[PDB]
Symmetry: C5
Subunit: 400 residues, 5 copies
């Protein structure tokens, strides 16, 4: 249109995009800064970066970009690309992208009275600390720090407006608790000019249904399965394979969880210590199995049963468990031969009678250690799982 042609010709006359558009040089320029969260793309525990989709929102007042609507009827807003008009050089301090500023440079909407609006979108790769002490029951606080790079207090001051989450799209993995900001200043040593900035802390809680169902219940189920070795009869000589096989499966599980995990040395992760507890449990199970197997295959002609073992395992450990202890000249020569055979059979029976005691002792030890291990595994898993804060309500909100 004719009027907007005239306006665009007139406005850029003697305009320098290198100057602050303030009527008075001494007075600072007021700039309002705010966010608009749209989505959380990914939270990388291993690399400790946070990727989000965010619309910035900056606004100020321009002294020179003013006109009277009466002289230019119909036109009431104008737009300018980058470089042609002055903009605040506000950029993220916590950036982790290769280019230090990931932000699409869009148009600047201008008032008929000098008020500019700037809403550039972009995908921001922050670098925030990822606490992993209570994984997978986590609450994370990642900070985004914005502010002018080469402008001070007398240059321009920054004011905070509350973050907008009206357009938030919920994420499958993380639950957004909130996003509160704060405006703070920082004085230097030379000069008493406040240097303001705005920081936003994004707080998220991990939803634990997936990690629970895929990590914890399988591991606890097969750890409970690992106690079946104490139920097998020792005569079926395939007890060791069970223990070693479940140990191998647990090792595979551990190395995968190490794969997902980062490599910080700040604290012992809950899942890692739980896996270590299961490691020790299965190892002690295998050791006890070897002990019982040694007891079962005892040589009858070897050493005698010690009195301590006899009085402990066969008496007290049986009372505790209420387990029952289930217990003519040639005529002389032929007589001697038959007597020899009978005596040999008697000796064989007496020798076999000894092995029964050892086998019963093996069964008793097996039952006792079964009970002890079954109690211990439950105690350990319950204590470790419930030791984490943010567990009861986490499970109540996820699994229910």
């Amino acid at each position: 249109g004719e009027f907007q042609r005239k306006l665009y010709k007139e406005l850029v006359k003697n305009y320098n995009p290198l100057e602050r558009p303030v009527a008075n040089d001494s007075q600072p320029l007021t700039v309002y800064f705010s966010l608009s969260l749209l989505q959380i793309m990914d939270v990388d525990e291993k690399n400790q970066v946070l990727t989000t989709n965010i619309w910035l929102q900056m606004s100020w007042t321009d002294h020179y970009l003013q006109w009277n609507v009466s002289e230019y009827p119909g036109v009431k807003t104008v737009r300018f690309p980058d470089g042609q008009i002055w903009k605040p050089d506000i950029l993220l301090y916590n950036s982790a992208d290769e280019r230090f500023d990931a932000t699409f440079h869009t148009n600047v909407l201008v008032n008929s009275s000098g008020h500019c609006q700037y809403l550039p979108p972009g995908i921001f790769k922050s670098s925030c600390y990822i606490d992993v002490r209570w994984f997978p029951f986590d609450v994370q606080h990642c900070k985004l720090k914005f502010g002018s790079w080469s402008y001070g207090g007398w240059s321009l001051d920054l004011q905070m407006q509350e973050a907008d989450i009206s357009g938030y799209i919920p994420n499958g993995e993380w639950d957004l608790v909130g996003i509160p900001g704060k405006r703070s200043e920082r004085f230097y040593e030379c000069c008493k000019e406040p240097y303001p900035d705005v920081t936003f802390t994004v707080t998220m809680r991990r939803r634990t249904l997936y990690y629970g169902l895929n990590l914890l219940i399988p591991c606890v189920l097969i750890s409970a399965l690992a106690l079946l070795v104490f139920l097998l009869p020792a005569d079926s000589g395939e007890k060791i394979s069970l223990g070693i096989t479940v140990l191998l499966s647990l090792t595979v599980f551990m190395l995968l969880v190490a794969e997902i995990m980062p490599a910080t040395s700040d604290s012992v992760p809950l899942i890692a210590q739980y896996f270590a507890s299961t490691m020790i449990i299965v190892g002690l199970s295998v050791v006890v199995t070897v002990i019982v197997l040694q007891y079962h295959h005892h040589d009858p002609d070897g050493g005698k049963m010690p009195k301590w073992t006899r009085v402990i395992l066969l008496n007290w450990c049986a009372w505790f468990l209420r387990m029952k202890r289930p217990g003519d000249p040639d005529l002389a020569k032929i007589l001697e031969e038959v007597r020899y055979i009978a005596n040999r059979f008697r000796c064989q029976d007496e020798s076999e009678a000894v092995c029964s005691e050892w086998k019963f002792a093996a069964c008793v030890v097996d039952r006792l250690c079964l009970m002890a291990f079954s109690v211990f595994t439950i105690i350990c898993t319950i204590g470790i799982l419930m030791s984490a804060p943010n567990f009861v309500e986490a499970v109540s909100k996820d699994f229910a």
Copy 2:
């Protein structure tokens, strides 16, 4: 040509690529927006990102870019590169590309009446929520949101033209149901103007043949083979070995299928339900095998058969399953030794006959659990697989 030289020189005179080319400044500018799908390149469920090849279609009527054909014979159209004429600032809202705009800027073809055509190509990475509840018998809807970034409804009013799929190249994995769009007018609280926008919802369906042949069926054969532990005779120890090795094969399968899919906590996936059910079936099979082995290797005098088991397993279950039960002074000394040997043999005979009942009971319970688990696996697999709403359609299309 001299005529096109003169025309190109004349058109750019006084032209301003900043002003919106309308004869009347008060009235808006109508812009027609459409789409042209070429192919779907990727659907990443783990990152929730859709990659497509798309040709944008825009069209508006410029005002100043007009000329008389008679004055410039031969010339019918002109072409302008980026930055030399006014273009709509149309952007994709939900984008996952690090650079927010992912369109290749090409020339604009302008007719002699002042009609501009803009057909920029590009590869678009938009983020859409990919439901995984009914995986792999899945149907997904992903939305693309387009619209001007900084032009209002009093200035630029979008219009819809139906999407073009004439050039579509079919995908191997995804079947395209269709891509219907819709035009809507959002209203601002300040002002009575509309804010037109156009959204395109791409609907696709996964083809269930690769997954069917590589994940579903192999698990069925492995689970079925896990029941071979029951037909096996307990005399040759292989039962626990069989059970555990099937278990680990299932674990590695579950690890694969877990690393394929994302960590969302919105619902339990169908494949997860199937694998968990197989987990439980194999574990219970191993437990039953342990019980059977305990029954088989029973000490002949370590106890007595309780009346409940003696009646049940030996008569009732044999009835149900139709299995038959498996069935001078120097001479008196010789007398008592020979009778002692005979008595020893008789005692051994009766003790050996005792264990036959225990072995038969083990066989009976083994057959019973075989039948029960054979029914259970079939029922569970059939129910879980047929629970999917479009299972019949998928099996009729992909397979038949």
Copy 3:
């Protein structure tokens, strides 16, 4: 050079890089398009993306860029950079790259009479369909579709010339067969004017010396070793172990072959069919082994062999496979004691005879199933591998 400087100054007077350089505006401008293949960098079966290294060859005639050599002695050719002279806008229609035009903008060499040459190199990524129906004996045809984006057939007469392969560098995996090209005219829904394009089809054949050694031969070897169970005597305890470990190795092998290959549902790959057949073979091997184990440990005093089963196994197959079957008052008291002992021994001998007959039946069944499984796996492997077309030619070229 003064002459070079003066000519460069003169050639750019009133030159518009926006106009098509023709003497008469009505007739189109002829452009010859070719292509110089240099290297096939990579073929991505999983992503259906082909990466090649090519040099474009465009040539046309510029009417304004002419000069008389007699007045410019030394200079015979000139070079112009990007954006200073008119260039055709030719780009790939199939680019699977984040940027839709991956070419390095080099100079344009100009004749002394107005002929322009343009040879921009670059690495081109394109999306072409990949066939896995005959993996790894497949022949792939991929397409490269070039054309002007914004010039119709009335302004750009695109022509074609044969592709150049004189500098081709052979690849270590794919053997180049040829690269023809054909011109075509297409109508687009945008506009009522044909748009010519030039399509080059690259035909290449995969060499099968690496896959034949690392995916086929090991599978055959361990499938054959899976038949070693039928030789192993049942008196040992390592038959089920053999079978199930073979299954584990086979599953790992198939899983890796699955991860390398694309997830298409258009056909069942040859390697997939082979792996499924081998899975079935080993599974039935395990089932037969279970049956033989149950036969060999058959408990006597239970059910006698059926007449049909006996007359089959002990006679027909036994003769067929050339197998031979394994074949004072105290005196009265002493008398009936020794009578009891002798009768006990006689009954024991009868029981052992029945057991020996059962074990012979098991051996015969094992031998027969050995023969059947061996012949069946041989014929299935040969048939599956020889079903593919151009298999013998590939075998000859690669191995011999």
Copy 4:
């Protein structure tokens, strides 16, 4: 303001951004260089690349950009963008980024007396030598070499200022020791002029809690479990299974650590030595188990035990380990028969005694090898771990 606009107009006048801003052309310009470490992001061992977040600091004195604040009251500082004033060309020599210069070009802040201050941020990837001889108890020294590219020592007098670590954010895995720097002068084959450069060395210590808990301790535990084969009675065939399965798990661990470790041939890693030692220990355990099993299943009436082995095993070693060694005509015909039976039984008893002595010898060998292997593995592990320098410092700082 008016003063700001006038000053910006005045400064730009007759300014060439190509000339070095010095009052005297023959005098070198002084530039102060400094660093500000913000965060160590990644230490890639395989690729030997260190990624850090760094702010560069540069400062010099421009001769032309000076003014009197009396004539320009409000304005005290001005800002200039890239490409409008002279800037140094300081760039990293060791950059490993695909684009050689990875820095964000910000404004340049200027005094009223011409003092320029330039603080460009950026994320720098540099190639530094990584030493893994003492992994995971290593201390690394990575250098960053900065310096002007095309400015010699007679024009740009580079100076170094101490690095700033006040804004350092501690990293979970790496511990910062110090960042000293020195300014050295070098000669290059290009030119006969010295080119000064500034090198900063980053010294980092690796926190070892993660690796100590995830790699060393589980390896220790399962290596110890591998010694249980010397407590299993030989009558249960489950010793080779134990040894070989632990060997398999060890091989898996070796594969994983080799995955983490880079391919280098400078010196053997400590963890590589540890895993090799564990390999040999477990292999020797398996060999000893094979020897013991061969001893146990001796066939009597065959090889008589040699006198040397007899005495060594059953006199000295057995006592040393406190092991106790275990241990009418018809009447004539019947006499002959009973004599034959008794003699056969006596021969069986003698064979049993020989078997018992062989089994006792096997047990003695087993116990002796158990003790030897235990002491050997303890000594080897403790020596290998303790050989690393500052291992005591590492454990004291991390664990305690």
Copy 5:
């Protein structure tokens, strides 16, 4: 300063960066090309690309950039950024980078007499054929081809200087042998115009210590462990398990080697041949073990040993292997009963004698195959390992 500004203003008058800076247009311009190796970043065997840190080095003479120092006393050199002066267009012919020119454009230093220096750094990625026939004892030649893209003999004749390896930082895996170069001229069909270019060949030798300690030694050790199946007595039921688990471990080792190595089909790698040989050895080890097991569990009444086997496995090899072969009417009824019992025991004795003879034959076969396999494995290993060229050089330079 003053003279700097004056000279900079004077040097750009009427200066066209598009023209070749020569005094005579007909005569060509001499350009000297060179290189400066800094580091070999990576050698990718799979994608077959080479990454290096390189500073190019070009030098030529400019006719127009000349001045007399006495007129401008302070300035001796001037610097021009990209786009201000004429630069030769020299780029990598065989680059394998997504952008065809990975080169950082720095300043150009010009002397008082017109000499120009241009040393742009960069991280180049070139695709060079990588031979893998001799892995890991490998020597690779990679060629870098540089040349002009638009100029020829009458326009630009590239001379040569030897590549500079001063300041080259040794890599931990690849040892540099040399970087020879060679200039050459190529003529076109039309005209006798040379087209000189410079090519550099980088020759590097892989250091084999890491691969020897991670791939060769462990596989030899496990292969030797596989031979232990020939010392385990047949009574233990753990002979098949040993061989099978060795096969599994070696399969996963082959998997790793498959992942590291390229998928070429031009030769059979040495490591591939060695792994195939070891596979074959273990396979016949398992086959022989099965034969021995079926030989040892031979029923006494199932047949008789053939004469050939009886004479070759019991008299010839036994001596060769130095093994010794191990070795009133009621009274009549009582007599007949005891005669029956004695005859029964006699038949048992003959049976176990035949069984013992069969077991001796099995042991002899076992020892024979042990010796044969022990010789064969070492023969094949030595042959394959020493078959490679420069293997003595590799071991001498790495392990000493």
